[PDB]
Amino acid sequence: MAFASLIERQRIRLLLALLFGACGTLAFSPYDVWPAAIISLMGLQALTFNRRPLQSAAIGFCWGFGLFGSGINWVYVSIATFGGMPGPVNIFLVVLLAAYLSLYTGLFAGVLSRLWPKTTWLRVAIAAPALWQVTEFLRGWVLTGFPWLQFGYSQIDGPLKGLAPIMGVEAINFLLMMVSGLLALALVKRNWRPLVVAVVLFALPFPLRYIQWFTPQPEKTIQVSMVQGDIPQWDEGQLLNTLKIYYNATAPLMGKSSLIIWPESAITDLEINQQPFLKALDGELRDKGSSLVTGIVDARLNKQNRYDTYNTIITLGKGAPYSYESADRYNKNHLVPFGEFVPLESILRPLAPFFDLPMSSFSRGPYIQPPLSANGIELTAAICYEIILGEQVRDNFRPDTDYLLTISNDAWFGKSIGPWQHFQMARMRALELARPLLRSTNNGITAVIGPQGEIQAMIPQFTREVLTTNVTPTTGLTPYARTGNWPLWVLTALFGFAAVLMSLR
Ligand SMILES: CCCCCCC/C=C/CCCCCCCC(=O)OC[C@@H](O)CO
Ligand SMILES: CCCCCCC/C=C/CCCCCCCC(=O)OC[C@@H](O)CO
Ligand SMILES: CCCCCCC/C=C/CCCCCCCC(=O)OC[C@@H](O)CO
Ligand SMILES: CCCCCCC/C=C/CCCCCCCC(=O)OC[C@@H](O)CO
Ligand SMILES: CCCCCCC/C=C/CCCCCCCC(=O)OC[C@@H](O)CO
Numbered sequence: 173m174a175f176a177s178l179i180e181r182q183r184i185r186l187l188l189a190l191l192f193g194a195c196g197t198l199a200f201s202p203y204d205v206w207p208a209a210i211i212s213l214m215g216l217q218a219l220t221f222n223r224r225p226l227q228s229a230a231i232g233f234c235w236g237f238g239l240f241g242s243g244i245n246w247v248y249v250s251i252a253t254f255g256g257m258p259g260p261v262n263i264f265l266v267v268l269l270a271a272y273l274s275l276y277t278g279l280f281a282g283v284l285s286r287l288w289p290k291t292t293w294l295r296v297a298i299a300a301p302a303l304w305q306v307t308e309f310l311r312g313w314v315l316t317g318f319p320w321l322q323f324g325y326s327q328i329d330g331p332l333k334g335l336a337p338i339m340g341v342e343a344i345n346f347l348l349m350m351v352s353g354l355l356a357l358a359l360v361k362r363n364w365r366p367l368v369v370a371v372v373l374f375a376l377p378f379p380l381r382y383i384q385w386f387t388p389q390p391e392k393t394i395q396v397s398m399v400q401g402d403i404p405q406w407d408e409g410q411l412l413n414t415l416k417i418y419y420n421a422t423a424p425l426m427g428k429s430s431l432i433i434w435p436e437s438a439i440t441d442l443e444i445n446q447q448p449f450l451k452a453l454d455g456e457l458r459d460k461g462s463s464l465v466t467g468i469v470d471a472r473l474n475k476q477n478r479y480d481t482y483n484t485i486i487t488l489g490k491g492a493p494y495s496y497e498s499a500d501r502y503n504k505n506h507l508v509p510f511g512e513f514v515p516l517e518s519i520l521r522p523l524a525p526f527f528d529l530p531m532s533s534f535s536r537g538p539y540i541q542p543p544l545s546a547n548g549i550e551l552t553a554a555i556c557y558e559i560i561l562g563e564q565v566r567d568n569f570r571p572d573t574d575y576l577l578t579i580s581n582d583a584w585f586g587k588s589i590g591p592w593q594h595f596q597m598a599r600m601r602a603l604e605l606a607r608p609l610l611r612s613t614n615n616g617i618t619a620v621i622g623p624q625g626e627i628q629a630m631i632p633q634f635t636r637e638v639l640t641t642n643v644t645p646t647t648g649l650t651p652y653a654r655t656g657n658w659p660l661w662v663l664t665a666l667f668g669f670a671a672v673l674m675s676l677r
């Protein structure tokens with residue numbers, strides 16, 4: 173009898189949930205098995221059927237734990253290499269992070285069955301997508317958020333990619349949970365009608381993939397070069413060898429590439445301390461008709477005679493004469509949680525011994541900043557983690573933007589799937605805004621993404637290489653570039669409002 177007790181059957185559901193959760197990791201790069209997203213969501217919606225809320229919440233937690241425990245544990249690579257803590261602590265911190273994010277899938281499951289206990293199409297097709305949209309927003313907002321592993325991104329090369337330029341990637345998250353909900357409903361109820369509807373709703377967006385919301389601008393085509401210095405991890409001697417690598421790789425490209433790009437924090441020294449190098453390089457670039465965009469750390473003295481330390485992008489050369497007082501620059505807005513700041517650190521700071529506090533704290537640039545301009549080219553900039561924040565990138569985008577720009581350094585996570593998941597989401601921005609995206613990294617993944625998310629050029633990871641190719645700007649506004657998120661939030665409110673009112677009836 174034991175195998176069939178009520179608690180054992182609940183536990184079986186918890187194990188299955190863990191498995192279905194882990195299957196969802198296969199949807200994202202480098203695995204790119206986009207059907208695994210539909211499989212993972214079908215289990216989440218099937219295993220929560222006919223459960224009390226706290227049971228369902230536990231199922232949603234274990235589902236998320238399988239998803240995040242298997243799709244985010246690459247953060248271990250950075251913790252174990254630079255954290256200085258024993259192995260067990262490092263494992264525990266990774267488990268901790270996955271348990272934290274699993275709270276939001278648990279919240280989704282608990283709320284879904286509490287308000288929509290019955291196995292309906294309303295539950296799986298109306299309430300679930302609406303509620304999923306809410307709990308996923310909270311995951312990406314609370315404590316500055318971590319909106320990593322959103323199944324919509326797995327459709328970058330899939331049947332539903334045509335929806336992203338219209339309503340953004342969250343619209344794909346929305347439809348996937350609806351389509352997966354109906355498939356789950358068809359199987360447990362062994363009924364063909366929800367299957368047909370799921371197939372229609374899933375296939376209707378297919379032709380949209382062929383819409384080109386943009387027009388190429390051939391007369392503005394240029395040769396761009398992206399230097400992948402592949403620099404490992406307080407030594408001037410090594411900074412000089414870093415400028416040597418970048419200068420020597422860049423010098424033969426001046427006069428040939430109109431735009432040259434070094435990655436995040438390529439110049440591993442304060443801008444204040446490199447005026448002679450930067451002015452000399454400015455002159456050489458200007459005298460050959462080339463421009464350089466580069467990452468750097470800028471400790472800027474402020475009104476209060478203190479230093480705001482920014483993660484910065486500077487410009488030099490033709491159409492961007494370098495100057496410490498230039499406004500042709502970009503300061504990272506969204507810092508990496510636990511990388512560039514610790515959440516809640518401002519509140520709990522007065523109690524910390526001064527000697528234990530970090531030497532410097534990173535400051536944040538404004539949420540909206542103008543495009544960078546180099547050699548007459550408009551570049552909407554995002555640094556590293558910022559490229560995953562679709563709404564933010566779209567609010568900095570302007571109709572005159574020629575290319576999206578992202579520079580980053582993903583060496584912290586070595587050979588793991590992290591950099592690939594990051595690269596995957598970056599491509600969704602190019603598709604959302606119908607602009608080519610230039611992605612310059614330290615040791616990968618360095619690539620040019622076309623206006624429909626396609627990989628147009630790329631150099632392999634872990635190589636000291638220059639990616640040189642011709643790139644063409646685009647003009648035109650996708651429906652999502654014009655609107656942003658609010659169309660889907662209306663649809664989410666319509667769905668949410670209609671579902672909860674019927675649950676009250
Ligand atoms: C068929 C039955 C098999 C039983 C369970 C199957 C489901 C698996 C998902 C479970 C995910 C667990 C999360 C723990 C964190 C991993 C970690 O410690 O980090 C590793 C990192 O060091 C490597 O980079
Ligand atoms: C600032 C932080 C706020 C974060 C927002 C989320 C709020 C949480 C409440 C609701 C959802 C989480 C509770 C259910 C999961 C825990 C559980 O039942 O575990 C069972 C499992 O362990 C069996 O093994
Ligand atoms: C330029 C503008 C282009 C605009 C294109 C965007 C398209 C987005 C809309 C897609 C969402 C439709 C969802 C309908 C739900 C039907 C349902 O719940 O069925 C239940 C039944 O199956 C139970 O048996
Ligand atoms: C009861 C409350 C429990 C709440 C959950 C606890 C969360 C634990 C996770 C902390 C460990 C993750 C460290 C990631 C390092 C990022 C990095 O490498 O930085 C890159 C940066 O340098 C690029 O600029
Ligand atoms: C003791 C304080 C307790 C505070 C409560 C826990 C808060 C949890 C929320 C968010 C934590 C997850 C962030 C992981 C960062 C890895 C990443 O994304 O880096 C990739 C690349 O972009 C870097 O270059």
Ligand SMILES: CCCCCCC/C=C\CCCCCCCC(=O)OC[C@@H](O)CO
Nearest residue numbers: 188191192194195197198242243245246589
């Ligand atoms: C009731 C019907 C039968 C139920 C069977 C369940 C079927 C679905 C799930 C598939 C199980 C595989 C989960 C792990 C996938 C590998 C992965 O995620 O690799 C991440 C790795 O890289 C860690 O970093």
